[PDB]
Design a protein around this ligand. Structure first.
Ligand SMILES: CCCCCCCCCCCCCCCCCC(=O)OC[C@H](CO[C@@H]1O[C@H](CO[C@H]2O[C@H](CO)[C@H](O)[C@H](O)[C@H]2O)[C@H](O)[C@H](O)[C@H]1O)OC(=O)CCCCCCCCCCCCCCCCC
Ligand SMILES: CCCCCCCCCCCCCCCCCC(=O)OC[C@H](CO[C@@H]1O[C@H](CO[C@H]2O[C@H](CO)[C@H](O)[C@H](O)[C@H]2O)[C@H](O)[C@H](O)[C@H]1O)OC(=O)CCCCCCCCCCCCCCCCC
Ligand code: CLA
Ligand code: CLA
Ligand code: CLA
Ligand code: CLA
Ligand code: CLA
Ligand code: CLA
Ligand SMILES: CC1=C(/C=C/C(C)=C/C=C/C(C)=C/C=C/C=C(C)/C=C/C=C(C)/C=C/C2=C(C)CCCC2(C)C)C(C)(C)CCC1
Ligand SMILES: CC1=C(/C=C/C(C)=C/C=C/C(C)=C/C=C/C=C(C)/C=C/C=C(C)/C=C/C2=C(C)CCCC2(C)C)C(C)(C)CCC1
Ligand code: OEY
Ligand SMILES: [Cl-]
Ligand SMILES: [Cl-]
Ligand SMILES: [Fe+2]
Lengths: 334, 36, 81, 442, 137, 341, 34
């Protein structure tokens, strides 16, 4: 009945339409700050000197951008990894030119999304659930940390953090490939397997359950009305699902235990995506994709090109053109 | 700017202490089954 | 469950390993020889380390004709002989 | 109740077999320290910088002052051998206690002696075990102080004259300095504790931590947890493991940044230059090359309008130009002679650059921590030739990976510990589903 | 194509005398060049002064001529600037500067020849790629 | 009781690997596409079609090995072994790219066979044929990329080559030449593949953490029985959880699993359509309004203009070695390059 | 009483026989020198 205790009970109430929780106490303000700044900058921020060379890139809609080309532009390379809050600028005009909004948005977002993951733990405890859904979300969350925080740290600049834009994203993945040969990096190859594989097993499992739905309806109505929310019996025939799938391949490559099947569904993309997040996080320290440039030579010592060499010619074209005005010296060491 | 900086320092400290004290207030006991 | 002999029971059987302790190295040696003798180069037309360019050549012997292509690579191969 | 694949969870309430697990695993750790060191020495070639050679353990020994003299010149390899042997030998003793306690000793300890036995829920016994280990840790940190002050010193990359081993006679005791580090921003130009740039502060902080750890060790032997701590924590073996997994994760992230940025307790002589260091070294290299040809590097406007060789930082310091503008917070013993109070001094640059600085810059620029997974050095478009990945890239990436999974491990075990404590870790009770007795949201 | 004696045959001195390396010497030189030199001279370029490369035409025009075994072995002993006017042992690996360039300490006299040999043969095999840079990768 | 029926009987026997009528198309074609790829990647070069080494025999590794496309001078020749190009000579056939068409065509008929298998077994077991339907997405991708794309181009040469690094090169070609990342059909595909991986993870995790306690052990896998009628996890608790965390949740298991079919299948179908556009160089390369502004206003710069410079570097730097039949000679001075690099 | 030769037998050896042969060829290759 005490004031603090009644507050505590409202924060942790399982009766709020949206759960707040103690993690929510930090998430809500920070996601609101990041969302509100993001929306306003995307529409109306003036151009930002991403690469510190007094060459501002225009990222917002009112400055001639569309949904596809617009972005919140990363802060100035002149700032590197220095903290640049609003109150460190002589004025908002300076803060805008140097890319201040990017920093505000990413720090609040990373914080708020971290608390999002904790909030998933918390409500699961309040509801008497097992606790590990948050572990599934750590795979996307790690990915966001890698491109917004870890890769700048290792490279020394939020200017090389991933842009908050559709085409900005593409600019980031093109430069990454030329500086790190990410395609030839095995952790990225595991991400692709995690993502291709994840979409495959999504399709498989959805098609396998859907194929074995038990007839509960007529042809004039959605089969979906054959399931009623909360019903105790299962709504498909898993043995029929197993009997089709086991024969499509062979018996023992098919799951007859739904718990093992669903845990496999969880782990495959989560682990692939951990690796591909690890990939970005370790290429942040410049431990790059396999390099087989000129690895095949003939008896005389002529180079016999492979597909790795052709890839290298593409990487080279990306390297020499990216940030065409920023380099004064012959090696792009960061 | 300094007014802004003080304000943000205050707002952040407030929320961080809600968090610290909220979890210090018998959080393990707020579950549906078994409370200590 | 379908009436074939279980795999577990086969690869612990003495009879199985009696055959496959011969069949498995024979095939491994077989494939080795395919390479060590040079037969694989000749069957597949794959260049040897010494036959990608002629000595002072740095031209790829690239096929450039559809119906005369057979004759082209034949010419490129004599340009080594 | 645990399957084979979670079988080590069967040791949770078997204190004797679990002791053997820990001690045998501690032997594995000491084994690898020993074996790896001896492998590195077997392969070591003294004429070659360590960082051309794949070495991660020899550099840690050299840094304590053994086997090296001025400049990191390796003078004596025997200390390296000794360290390997004693570690390798000591792991047999730990191996021996390990397999003994794990297979033959008493499964559970608490019936043998009431001293070594424990129950995870015995909050007093647990803080006592904690305290003993705190005192041990405190002792260890003072061992470092003893080596620095009484048994030969430490390698000091900053020592005047190119670096050398030096005895630390005046460790920083001022807590404004020691704990000042703990309150610096972790952002650029500040860098939290990673910026520690002199051995006085390193030795001094290890005095503090040793004393703090001993003090706290005695505290926890002597006390029991207060009620506010009793009510905020989960008291169980898994819960304690989860607490430590989080701490290990945090520490691994710190070490990653340490080895990537700090060139004081990871001297560049041994580990290779930092990313920032190498990037600054390239600007230095061409500044030197161009000035010798007659360029006036102070007045040379680059394509963008900014200085081609020199510009200002956002606070005005004179700094190296080009993309390396981002690395102006870098400080290294080969560079600081050129720095005045406005940053790089143009008159020192014109007149006072020494051949050893030209050499060091050329070397560090060509040994930047960039490399493929198969150890082809340089940018990713470089051809094969140079077999090189920097020790710092190997050390940063490995420990980022490890730190990350330990965080996952912390979430895994912390969540489980909570649910096991409340009694729903194995699933929902069908006859008592909490949500079915809650009001509908809408 | 293969590593024939014609290719392994390189000028010894500026008189015009020639010397024919063995395949052994050539692979010796390549190994040694990777050990002592490639960190700056991978592919016949010079990362720390890209204006000066190891193409034979460049060496030929150096003072003293360096397009021959003698000139190159001498360079490794007492390196000079391209015009011959100053000795640069202080900042270039050399036997004369092996106290400060420790990798040169175990180079023997025939190692120098193998290295100089590698440098002269490689342009004959690789052509423009040697000393050409990334354009030719 | 005629022969046709007897064969039906034998084809449809329950055995460790079911055969079926569809087995007659599937098994030979799948075995041959697969064996063609392992034969080519182990032993066959690309020297005469591409100027590349591409087998283990030649010194390549798993990442760089490939069965490469035929020379551009072959056009869209079937390159039959007995056709006018190879003239029955196995060796020349290998050297001219014959294994590329062998794999691609046998692969195509294998894929058909595999989808006929899904139809055949589903009918025999008595389930709905939604797993076959789903499989239409892989088919659409394969035909669009490996068949339609190069049939719109000058030759098979510009199809993907069957190898790891060769496909990586195919990705980068499409960036530089088609600006494929800018294409809204690729974008819908990305959202379907990533959306699908999300669904896969979020659904598996939700079931594993809304489980009912149906056994005493700490391994919860033991406590399921494939013939139990009861759901093994709580949809109710799952729904309340996600409703409170995310705001919306599934309430209908049927719709949920149909959505899981729908999302990745559609994404793949959308990307197929876009690659059909690229068969004709029908690209979403540019935004006209941006180019007109940037031509007139040299201070105007976006990530869109930045990325085209990158495409321009790619084209000029990879084209001569990637299209050897064009004999592109770009002297140094014409290559696009920024400062210093 | 189990058959020895089955459809299964055949599918197994269809794949396994050339695998080993191919592994042996790929083994020889690690010793090829230019
Ligand atoms: C427990 C609850 C925790 C909650 C607390 C949250 C508040 C802290 C937030 C931390 C923000 C980290 C940003 C780091 C940015 C950067 O500049 O960080 C690097 C800094 C080091 O800073 C660098 O420090 C350097 C120190 O070197 C200086 O001094 C040296 C002395 O030898 C050398 O001379 C060198 O040349 C010279 O520059 C300089 O100051 C550089 O300018 C400066 O960038 O690292 C450090 O502070 C060390 C620690 C950084 C940790 C970052 C790891 C992030 C882990 C994220 C994992 C996400 C996983 C998600 C899971 C799902
Ligand atoms: C089926 C079989 C089972 C295999 C299961 C797969 C488990 C993973 C292991 C892969 C299998 C191959 C391992 C053996 C081949 C290999 O690696 O062989 C490589 C070497 C042995 O090869 C030597 O590798 C060396 C690599 O260069 C190193 O040595 C050079 C020597 O001058 C330089 O010093 C250079 O800078 C330095 O980096 C050289 O290339 C030598 O020539 C070459 O002989 O083994 C190593 O090092 C051994 C080190 C093993 C420990 C790995 C520790 C690394 C942790 C980093 C984690 C980073 C995470 C990011 C991931 C991305
Ligand atoms: C201090 C570290 C530590 C300790 C003591 C434990 C202890 C425990 N964990 Mg935890 N765990 C940790 C870290 C730790 N964990 C981390 C960092 C993670 C995240 C990855 C986890 C994730 C985790 C899960 C998901 C689970 C546990 C479980 C458990 C329990 C049983 C584990 C078992 O039998 O494993 C048996 C060991 C194996 C099956 C072998 C795994 C081998 C790994 C995956 C391969 C690594 C190979 C290497 C990288 C390269 C190979 C090279 C090649 C040449 C071989 C036990 C209480 C289980 C539990 O909750 O029970 C209470 C459980 O389900 N752990
Ligand atoms: C954990 C820290 C760590 C770090 C940073 C290194 C780093 C290094 N080691 Mg050491 N090493 C370690 C652990 C570590 N090692 C362990 C545990 C062993 C015992 C197996 C060794 C045994 C060893 C030998 C025998 C040798 C090295 C060598 C090297 C160097 C080259 C590494 C390389 O090419 O790997 C290639 C990269 C991989 C194999 C990647 C592994 C990917 C894993 C499976 C994914 C991880 C999943 C999760 C954990 C590098 C300096 C070599 C060297 O230069 O010696 C002087 C060398 O010969 N190391
Ligand atoms: C650091 C690694 C590590 C360690 C130290 C342990 C330790 C232990 N495990 Mg775990 N475990 C591990 C990894 C590890 N495990 C992994 C990776 C898995 C997944 C495969 C498991 C799965 C697992 C299961 C499923 C079970 C255990 C159990 C046990 C305990 C009893 C083992 C026993 O009686 O075996 C007896 C084994 C033998 C008699 C065989 C010989 C083994 C010896 C020690 C080999 C050492 C050789 C060495 C070279 C000798 C040097 C001697 C010299 C020092 C004097 C023991 C404390 C058991 C347990 O908790 O029981 C209650 C149990 O049921 N473990
Ligand atoms: C932290 C590790 C650890 C812990 C907690 C224990 C705990 C225990 N052991 Mg195990 N043991 C260990 C390590 C450990 N041991 C190792 C490494 C070995 C192999 C050398 C053994 C071999 C061993 C045997 C053979 C036996 C035990 C027994 C016992 C029990 C009685 C101990 C006693 O009264 O001894 C009396 C205590 C002493 C004589 C004091 C010893 C002081 C040591 C030698 C110095 C410590 C200094 C420092 C910590 C070492 C570091 C030096 C190095 C870094 C250079 C007890 C539960 C007994 C048992 O359980 O029987 C059923 C038993 O028979 N232990
Ligand atoms: C291995 C290290 C270790 C561990 C695991 C513990 C564990 C414990 N300590 Mg002991 N303690 C230690 C070392 C350790 N201690 C040492 C060395 C000392 C001497 C200084 C003490 C002194 C001490 C006292 C005086 C007390 C404890 C108490 C406790 C209990 C409550 C802990 C708690 O609530 O912390 C959680 C901490 C908080 C809720 C507040 C901490 C806020 C910090 C500043 C956050 C900073 C994190 C940030 C991201 C990192 C940057 C650091 C920043 C300073 C720059 C617990 C059993 C309490 C108890 O019950 O004792 C009987 C108690 O009153 N400890
Ligand atoms: C059964 C499945 C199957 C299918 C669908 C294919 C399909 C194909 N194969 Mg593959 N092939 C198969 C099995 C299969 N093959 C087997 C088992 C082998 C191993 C011997 C091969 C070996 C093989 C090679 C070596 C090649 C192909 C090629 C081809 C392609 C061209 C085939 C063609 O032109 O047919 C033409 C023939 C027909 C369509 C037959 C029609 C039959 C009619 C209806 C009956 C005619 C009766 C006769 C005229 C009357 C008697 C005459 C009188 C004297 C009495 C095509 C994609 C070629 C290819 O991929 O090119 C790149 C190629 O080079 N196949
Ligand atoms: C040595 C050295 C030094 C020093 C150091 C030091 C002195 C440090 C310290 C450190 C420290 C001083 C640390 C601390 C830490 C802490 C922490 C890390 C914390 C944590 C916390 C937590 C975790 C909590 C949580 C919670 C909450 C919040 C609520 C309720 C629940 C709980 C309790 C869970 C120097 C740098 C000079 C130099 C070099 C060397
Ligand atoms: C083309 C042709 C043909 C056919 C052919 C064939 C059909 C073949 C087959 C082939 C095959 C059938 C082959 C196989 C191969 C195999 C391989 C070569 C394998 C390998 C593998 C491996 C190496 C593995 C390993 C591993 C790893 C690496 C990791 C993980 C684990 C494991 C163990 C998996 C004919 C006659 C009609 C004629 C025309 C042409
Ligand atoms: O890749 Mn290329 O490297 Ca990482 O910096 Mn140097 O150039 Mn620029 O700032 Mn963004 O980008
Ligand atoms: Cl760019
Ligand atoms: Cl630059
Ligand atoms: Fe499902």
């Amino acid at each position: 009945a005490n004031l603090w205790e009644r507050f505590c009970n409202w924060v942790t109430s399982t009766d709020n339409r949206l759960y707040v929780g103690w993690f929510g106490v930090i998430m809500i303000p920070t996601l609101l700050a990041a969302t509100i700044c993001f929306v306003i900058a995307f529409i109306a921020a003036p151009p930002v000197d991403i690469d510190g060379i007094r060459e501002p890139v225009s990222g917002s809609l009112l400055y001639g951008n569309n949904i596809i080309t617009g972005a919140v532009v990363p802060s100035s390379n002149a700032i590197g990894l220095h903290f640049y809050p609003i109150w460190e600028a002589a004025s908002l005009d300076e803060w805008l030119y140097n890319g201040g909004p990017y920093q505000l948005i990413i720090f609040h977002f990373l914080l708020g999304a971290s608390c999002y993951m904790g909030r998933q733990w918390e409500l699961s405890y309040r509801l008497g659930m097992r606790p590990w859904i948050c572990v599934a979300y750590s795979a996307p969350l790690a990915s966001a940390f890698a491109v917004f925080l870890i890769y700048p740290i290792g490279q020394g600049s939020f200017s090389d953090g991933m842009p908050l834009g559709i085409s900005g994203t593409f600019n980031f993945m093109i430069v990454f490939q030329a500086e790190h040969n990410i395609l030839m990096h095995p952790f990225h190859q595991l991400g692709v397997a995690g993502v291709f594989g994840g979409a495959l097993f999504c399709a498989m499992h959805g098609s396998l359950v859907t194929s074995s739905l038990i007839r509960e309806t007529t042809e004039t109505e959605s089969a979906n009305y054959g399931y009623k929310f909360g019903q105790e019996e299962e709504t498909y025939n898993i043995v029929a699902a197993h009997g089709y799938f086991g024969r499509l391949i062979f018996q023992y490559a098919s799951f007859n235990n739904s718990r093992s099947l669903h845990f496999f569904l969880a782990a495959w993309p989560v682990v692939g995506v951990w690796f591909t997040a690890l990939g970005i996080s370790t290429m942040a320290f410049n431990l790059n994709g396999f390099n087989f440039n000129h690895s095949v030579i003939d008896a005389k010592g002529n180079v016999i090109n492979t597909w790795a060499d052709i890839i290298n010619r593409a990487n080279l074209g990306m390297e020499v053109m990216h940030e065409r005005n920023a380099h004064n010296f012959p090696l792009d060491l960061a | 700017m300094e007014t802004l900086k003080i304000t943000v320092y205050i707002v952040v400290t407030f929320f961080v202490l809600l968090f610290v004290f909220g979890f210090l207030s018998g959080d393990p006991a707020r579950n549906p089954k078994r409370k200590d | 469950t379908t009436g074939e002999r279980p795999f577990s029971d086969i690869i612990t059987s003495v009879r199985y390993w009696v055959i496959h302790s011969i069949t498995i190295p024979a095939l491994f040696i077989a494939g080795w020889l395919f390479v060590s003798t040079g037969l694989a180069y000749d069957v597949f037309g794959t260049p040897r380390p010494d036959s990608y360019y002629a000595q002072e050549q740095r031209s790829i012997p690239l096929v450039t004709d559809r119906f005369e292509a057979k004759q082209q690579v034949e010419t490129f191969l004599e340009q080594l002989k | 109740g645990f399957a084979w694949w979670a079988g080590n969870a069967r040791l949770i309430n078997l204190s004797g077999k679990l002791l053997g697990a820990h001690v045998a695993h501690a032997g594995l750790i000491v084994f690898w320290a020993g074996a790896m060191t001896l492998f590195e020495l077997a392969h070591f070639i003294p004429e070659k910088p360590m960082y051309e050679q794949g070495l991660i353990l020899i550099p840690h020994i050299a840094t304590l002052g053994w086997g090296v003299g001025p400049g990191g010149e390796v003078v004596d390899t025997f200390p390296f051998f000794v360290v390997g042997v004693v570690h390798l030998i000591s792991s047999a003793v730990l191996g021996f206690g390990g397999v003994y306690h794990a297979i033959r000793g008493p499964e559970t300890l608490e019936e043998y002696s009431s001293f070594f036995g424990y129950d995870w829920k015995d909050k007093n016994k647990m803080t006592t075990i904690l305290g003993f280990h705190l005192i041990v840790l405190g002792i260890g940190a003072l061992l470092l102080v003893a080596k620095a002050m009484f048994f030969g010193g430490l390698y000091d990359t900053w020592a005047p004259g190119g670096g050398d081993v030096r005895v630390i006679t005046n460790p920083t005791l001022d807590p404004r300095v020691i704990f000042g580090y703990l309150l610096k921003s972790p952002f650029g130009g500040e860098g939290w504790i990673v910026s520690v740039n002199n051995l006085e502060d390193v030795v001094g902080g290890h005095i503090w931590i040793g004393l703090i750890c001993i003090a706290g060790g005695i505290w926890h032997i002597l006390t029991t947890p207060f009620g506010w701590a009793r009510r905020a924590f989960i008291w169980s073996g898994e819960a304690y493991l989860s607490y430590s997994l989080g701490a290990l994760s945090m520490m691994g992230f710190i070490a990653t940044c340490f080895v990537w940025f700090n060139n004081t307790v990871y001297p560049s002589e041994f580990y290779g230059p930092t990313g920032p260091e190498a990037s600054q070294a390239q600007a230095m290299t061409f500044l030197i090359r161009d000035q010798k040809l007659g360029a006036n590097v102070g007045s040379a406007q680059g394509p963008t309008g900014l200085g081609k060789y020199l510009m200002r930082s956002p606070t005005g310091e004179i700094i190296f130009g080009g993309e390396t503008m981002r690395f102006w917070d870098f400080r290294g013993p080969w560079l600081e002679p050129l720095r005045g109070p406005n940053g790089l001094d143009l008159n020192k640059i014109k007149n006072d650059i020494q051949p050893w600085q030209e050499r060091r810059a050329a070397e560090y620029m060509t040994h930047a921590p960039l490399g493929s997974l198969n150890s082809v050095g340089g940018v990713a478009t470089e051809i094969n030739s140079v077999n090189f990945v920097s020790p710092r890239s190997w050390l940063a990436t490995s420990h980022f990976v490890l730190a990350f999974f330990f965080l996952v491990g912390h979430l895994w075990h912390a969540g489980r510990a909570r649910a096991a404590a409340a009694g729903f870790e194995k699933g929902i009770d069908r006859e008592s589903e909490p949500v079915l007795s809650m009001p509908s949201l809408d | 194509a293969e590593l024939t004696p014609e290719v392994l045959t390189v000028p010894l001195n500026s008189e015009g005398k020639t010397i024919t390396l063995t395949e052994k010497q050539y692979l010796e030189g390549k190994r040694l060049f990777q050990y002592a030199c490639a960190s700056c001279h991978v592919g016949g370029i010079t990362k720390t002064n890209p204006s000066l490369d190891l193409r034979t035409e460049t060496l030929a025009l150096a003072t003293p001529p360096r397009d021959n075994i003698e000139g190159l072995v001498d360079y490794m002993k007492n390196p000079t600037t391209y015009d011959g006017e100053q000795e640069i042992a202080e900042v270039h690996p050399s036997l004369r500067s092996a106290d400060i360039f420790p990798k040169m300490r175990n180079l023997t006299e025939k190692d120098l020849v193998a290295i100089a040999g590698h440098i002269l043969v490689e342009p004959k095999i690789l052509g423009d790629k040697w000393g050409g840079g990334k354009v030719y990768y | 009781r005629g022969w046709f029926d007897i064969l039906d009987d034998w084809l449809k026997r329950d055995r460790f690997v079911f055969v079926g009528w569809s087995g007659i198309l599937l098994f030979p074609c799948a075995y041959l596409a697969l064996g063609g790829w392992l034969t080519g990647t182990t032993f066959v070069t690309s020297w005469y079609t591409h100027g590349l080494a591409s087998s283990y025999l030649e010194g390549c590794n798993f990442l760089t090995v490939a069965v490469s496309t035929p020379a551009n001078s072959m056009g869209h020749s079937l390159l039959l072994l007995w056709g006018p190009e190879a003239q029955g000579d196995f060796t020349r056939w290998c050297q001219l790219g014959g294994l590329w068409t062998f794999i691609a065509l046998h692969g195509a008929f294998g894929l058909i066979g595999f989808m006929l298998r899904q139809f055949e077994i589903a009918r025999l077991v008595g389930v709905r044929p939604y797993n076959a339907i789903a499989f239409s997405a892989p088919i659409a991708v394969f035909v669009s990329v490996f068949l339609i794309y190069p049939l719109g181009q000058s030759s098979w040469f510009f199809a993907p080559s069957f190898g790891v690094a060769a496909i990586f090169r195919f990705l980068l070609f499409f960036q530089g030449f088609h600006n494929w990342t800018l294409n809204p059909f690729h974008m819908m595909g990305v959202a379907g593949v990533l959306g699908g991986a999300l669904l896969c993870a979020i659904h598996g995790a939700t079931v594993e953490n809304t489980l009912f306690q149906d056994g005493e052990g700490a391994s919860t896998f033991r406590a399921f029985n494939p013939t139990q009628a009861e759901e093994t996890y709580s949809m109710v608790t799952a729904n309340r959880f996600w409703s409170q965390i995310f705001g919306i949740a599934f309430s209908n298991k049927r719709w949920l699993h149909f959505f899981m079919l729908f999302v990745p299948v559609t994404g793949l179908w959308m990307s197929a359509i876009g690659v059909v556009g690229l068969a004709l160089n029908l690209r979403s390369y540019d935004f006209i309004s941006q180019e007109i502004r940037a031509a007139e206003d040299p201070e105007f710069e976006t990530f869109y203009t930045k990325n085209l410079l990158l495409n321009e570097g790619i084209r000029a730097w990879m084209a001569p070695q990637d299209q050897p039949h064009e004999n592109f000679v770009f002297p140094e001075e014409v290559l696009p390059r920024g400062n210093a690099l | 009483s189990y058959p020895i030769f089955t459809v299964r037998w055949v599918a197994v050896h269809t794949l396994a026989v050339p695998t080993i042969f191919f592994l042996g060829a790929i083994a020889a290759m690690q010793f090829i020198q230019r």
